[PDB]
């Protein structure tokens, strides 16, 4: 007799159709506040339009608040990066925005040496066994 075990599938984003990780970016600035100058300049100066043209899968919100200028991204996995861009020039802000768009949303993490590939798949060759080895031990 055979019975099922209820189990769910694991989504591999890349393999079938690539859904782009960055979904939304919020440009936040202040009209007062000298720290928000470079952000304000960026918003003004035709760069944002170009960016939006380049990346039509990201939505680009533009908000005004009293505090420091902010770049909060929003990713497919549900995580949210928020970069404060206080006192940065236009070009630095743009670089920060580029960095954000590049990111897959996942948390930052220490990797050990050669911790390269991350598989869900069972090994193509088996796992080693001392009884089934080619050269028997002594």
């Amino acid at each position: 007799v055979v019975k099922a075990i209820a189990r769910n599938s694991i989504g591999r984003n890349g393999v079938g159709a690539f859904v782009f990780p960055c979904r939304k970016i919020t440009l936040q600035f202040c009209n007062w506040g000298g720290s928000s100058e470079g952000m304000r300049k960026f918003l003004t100066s035709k760069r944002l339009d170009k960016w939006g043209q380049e990346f039509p899968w990201i939505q680009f919100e533009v908000m005004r608040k009293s505090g420091h200028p902010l770049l909060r991204a929003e990713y497919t996995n549900g995580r949210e990066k928020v970069i404060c861009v206080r006192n940065l020039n236009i070009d630095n802000v743009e670089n920060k925005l580029k960095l954000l768009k590049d990111s897959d949303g996942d948390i930052l993490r220490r990797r050990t040496k050669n911790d390269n590939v991350e598989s869900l798949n069972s090994s193509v060759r088996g796992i080693w066994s001392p009884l089934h080895a080619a050269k028997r031990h002594r």
Binding site: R12, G14, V15, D102, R109, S119, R125
Partner: protein, 118 residues
């Protein structure tokens, strides 16, 4: 090169090399390159070229590299990112000056989308 058993097999692995760094992969595997890719943006597809070994459970084709005609191996660039920020401190043994060696290396997450014998 009679590549028939490899072609037949349902499971199949590759050992492609990026800058002589080997990465053993199947389809769906998620490679994490320890550097910033400049050529490819996120979403771009990489056709792997320096493929050393292509293996089934009991057979393996090997080349230096293997003929590009014999196989396919498409990775997708699924996010440039970084390692966690670390600050190890550097100092000598009777010296109050303690230089902070800040570090936050770059990563590029690839995903092996296609891997098959052509």
């Amino acid at each position: 090169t009679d590549t028939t058993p490899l072609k037949l097999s349902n499971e199949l692995y590759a050992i492609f090399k990026i800058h002589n760094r080997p990465y053993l992969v199947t389809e769906g595997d998620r490679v994490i390159l320890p550097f910033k890719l400049k050529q490819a943006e996120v979403g771009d597809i990489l056709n792997m070229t320096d493929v050393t070994t292509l293996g089934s459970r009991n057979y393996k084709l090997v080349g230096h590299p293997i003929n590009t005609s014999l196989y396919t191996l498409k990775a997708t660039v699924v996010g440039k990112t970084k390692r966690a920020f670390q600050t190890r401190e550097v100092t000598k043994r009777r010296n109050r000056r303690v230089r902070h060696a800040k570090s936050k290396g770059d990563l590029t997450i690839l995903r092996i989308s296609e891997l098959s014998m052509n």
